[model samples]
Target: LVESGGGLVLKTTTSVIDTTNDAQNLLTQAQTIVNTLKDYCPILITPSWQTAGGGKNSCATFGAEFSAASDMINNAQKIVQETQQLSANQPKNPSSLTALAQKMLKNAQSQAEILKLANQVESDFNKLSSGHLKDYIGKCDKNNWGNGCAGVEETQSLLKTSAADFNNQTPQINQAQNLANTLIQAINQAVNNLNERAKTLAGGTTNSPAYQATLLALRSVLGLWNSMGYAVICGNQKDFHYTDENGNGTTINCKADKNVSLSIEQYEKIHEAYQILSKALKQAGLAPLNSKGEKLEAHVTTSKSSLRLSCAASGRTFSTAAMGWFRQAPGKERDFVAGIYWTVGSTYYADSAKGRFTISRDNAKNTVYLQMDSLKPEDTAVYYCAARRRGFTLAPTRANEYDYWGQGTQVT
Candidate 1:
């Protein structure tokens, strides 16, 4: 169980790394959106309208430039479309998600530019209509739309609404970027915690520092998840606190309804990344009984106290072994030698030999069992299968680093 804890710790880090990659992919696509605007924005000549009000007043000239910029419109829409795809995917690593997350901020920074340019384009069109284009709108047919003074009102209204929409989107776009940044910043903090865990994983401790670290990271993210309901980025502190009965004291950071999205599709990609990381860490262990990430349901019924200790929650592998203490209805007797699922072994002073406990696994291998050959009433004590416990002594002078204690079940 100790060593199993170590591996599970690494597994969670990997999940963190994976989700980060997904986040990177989103950033990559985001970069391309900026590219579309950057590359195309320059070619976008404003509507060159002409009349008593101006010198370069030709609707035909305006249409030609509009064609240049409008041609880029599909690409612009495509960029927005791409965000949805990215949102659908996301990444992980213990100390890992950091590198990519760092890169994402750079990409996310462009958000300001994108929104800024969007408004510029809209404003440019509005000005053109007022300056010279409108003089023609009242007389032109749809086909005659850009036909100068005799152009189309219908097409004028159509493009006008679209341009007006671009102008309207500035605030929403700005709001989403800032809100999403809150999430990004919060994730980065988790990454920092994971980074320290990586150092622990390297030394190979017995306390499952890696595993514990991952849990801490997940707890941080789950906080972010809840924070989504509110806000994120600069700092993470929310209105409420989520503490497991015996769990770690990780506070959620985010506020309420005023918090929002940059783009719904964009937000989806970021949101998905959080879930991937969250699920990776969470799925590895059964729901812990308390906030400390150590307590379990501690109850399972069996014949004659043949305790049905389960390995159901976590499927991560560690050779099997059971280390436990007994509070036999009253006078509690206690607990092991070193090893991974008893995979690691050494001399214990034999005080542990008192129980006839043996271990076995079911066909699915998702659950492991511990029992005495003949169930005795005395066995009516709490039995904890060191299911996800084990560790390596990082140094000769140090104890084991594995600290993960699997779910415990009490036998009446």
Candidate 2:
């Protein structure tokens, strides 16, 4: 039963884990997992937790494992729902997410006058076609008037062209406005999860589960912000969004000097929230660290136990692995990966430096390694490790690419 269910469950989970932007897909996949596991849970996970043994082993039957598996399915449902929302609300290819209404409306405003004049001309084109010259007024003597109304025909011909122009421009007006409206609706929804997050989650001293939920949601949100920022085009068009400071779910506007617009201000808003949360998570012990539970400082102090990742020498080499967990969607084989990065600025990227450190990971062991044989003084900066479950086409995004597992080095 476990095998049969696990087989179908793996494929369903894979699809769910691989996709984004489709809330329905995520929800459906979650349901499929729950369905497959229903019987499997009742049989396998339950009775064990209940009273698998008698005498010393004891026997009352709580089936805690059964409840645990069931809870996993339930949590999966809620999580998939929120992530589905994040996919839709967060930034994506502007072409896909755009309020083309903004662009369409852009042209409409200036062209309105031109459209009006075109209409006026065509309206007169018909009148002048049949009738009299008022005191011989208006646009020259059309060959002393009517011979089957020659000038009127010419005027009407021009009107026909103008009419066509008006017809084309008219529909775009509404279409574009509607698009803008949709985009606004999507933006408002973007922060909905962030807005709804428990305020106390931030203040939790022990890093309770609710706060963990907030972090998971924050991960989704920040990942989205990164992807969306990538889609934000500067100088191509003007963009507007409600001021989203700390998930305010409110309004504010800030722009750049015109070139690379929105990026600076947008960075400020998102990064500030990120900074606070990152610090809080670290303080709360939710943040990843060396095995011994301390940052790898100046030199390789003591030998590495579980928490301490030691340096090779003052300026030679060092390796650090932080323990964190990432299981594939079905909770099966996960690559269990980590990376090395350095930063002088607010952002940290792997490509920032050369092959200063070779890295590897082992999921069976839950460890990440960094082999930095040559450490320059410049390399003495803060380094970070990011943990991810690797898959085909499953690389990290801008927000997620940077690991929050941060540590500083001490190279003489």
Candidate 3:
């Protein structure tokens, strides 16, 4: 039961792991936004934080408040970091954890944007007041109506615009505070949810439903035990143990069946049969079959290492080939398993490849053939064929960029 259920349960566990990873990513984003707010928070404290009048240093007081806000942002960052660390492990309720963490990131971004707007507002305020018109307006002799008084009307107009600009910040400030509160509340709730999900199972009795369910799940994963018992291929040594990062581990005892022959040929035939069985399972889901009412034969091929290409100006043609067996799958035509490439010393140019090389594949023989044309003594270098999984369209600029490369044939 452990062997049979092991694969399925691990696949299910992958979903939970993926959810935790998603939560970690969200927390990371929230931390970044909180850091942004922390860095940009001081932008609101322009005018040197000192009032011109003898009144209380209102700007200075706001600076202190801003420092406190920075502290709050720092604490928020800690929360985000702690949550991210918690998510590094597997969680019991993954979907809920991911959703709540997403909410935290969204609120953090909203607050950051609100704070970002204040930076723009402060810029406008500084630029408008920089003309020193407000300072000159009080000194203007309005009763004498001189040249100094002439600029007083312009100063008044500029002052009105500056006042309006400053007034607009009131609503933005209120909105920012609201976002801060919302973000804090979200952090609190998300942290609580994360803690709850991170908790271990309670009630340790064998009669408990959770314990029984856990045993029921573990039964399938125990299939490794059966595989280890009957097949030497699984492991020749007894009592193989594996542990995941979260401290969950399992032990499988290897005991090859005496009745079964452990010869290499026997194992190969069994493996071949298993491959055919896997194809059969796929065809059971309405997959197409070949014209002979059977699945295509499996393919096996390997390129030979170090083949000689005769070097001369007359251009000796040589073929770099894959030697193996292959068969056709229904509707799965042979595509990219037959591309050949060469590097003259080291550099391969896709622009020059077409004129120098021709590629072909013999499906019946499971061979990838690459015939290079007109090679000179200057062309003595390494040649290889690419066996692509997803077939390439127009080749990229270089053959070295291909994923599946051959052992390579060196021409001298």
lDDT of each residue in 63-94, candidate 3, tens digit only: 33323323333332332233233333322222
State the lDDT of candidate 2 residue by residue for 15-112, as single tens digits. Answer: 01112222222224333322332332222111122234322211122123223323433443443333333323322222453443433333333233
lDDT of 2 at 264: 36
Looking at model 2, which ten-residue stretch has the lowest summed lDDT?
1-10
Assess the local accuracy of residue 183 in candidate 2 as a C-alpha lDDT between 0 and 100.
43
Q: After superposition, how far is residue 227 of candidate 3 from its true place, in Å?
A: 80
lDDT of each: 0.32, 0.29, 0.29
The candidates, ranked best first by TM-score, are 1, 2, 3
Off by over 4 Å in 1: 1-93, 135-412
Query: Ten consecutive residues with minimal summed lDDT in candidate 1?
Result: 5-14
* Model 2 stretches astray by more than 4 angstroms: 1-103, 125-130, 134-152, 165-169, 183-412
Which candidate leads the pack in TM-score? 1
Cα RMSD for predicted model 3? 30.1
RMSD (CA, Å), each prediction: 29.8, 33.4, 30.1
TM-score of candidate 3 on Cα atoms, chains taken together: 0.16
Point out the worst 10-residue segment of candidate 3 by lDDT.
1-10
After TM-score superposition, the amount by which residue 169's alpha carbon in candidate 1 deviates from its true location, in angstroms, is 10
Q: How badly does each model clash, as a count of residue pairs?
A: 62, 8, 11
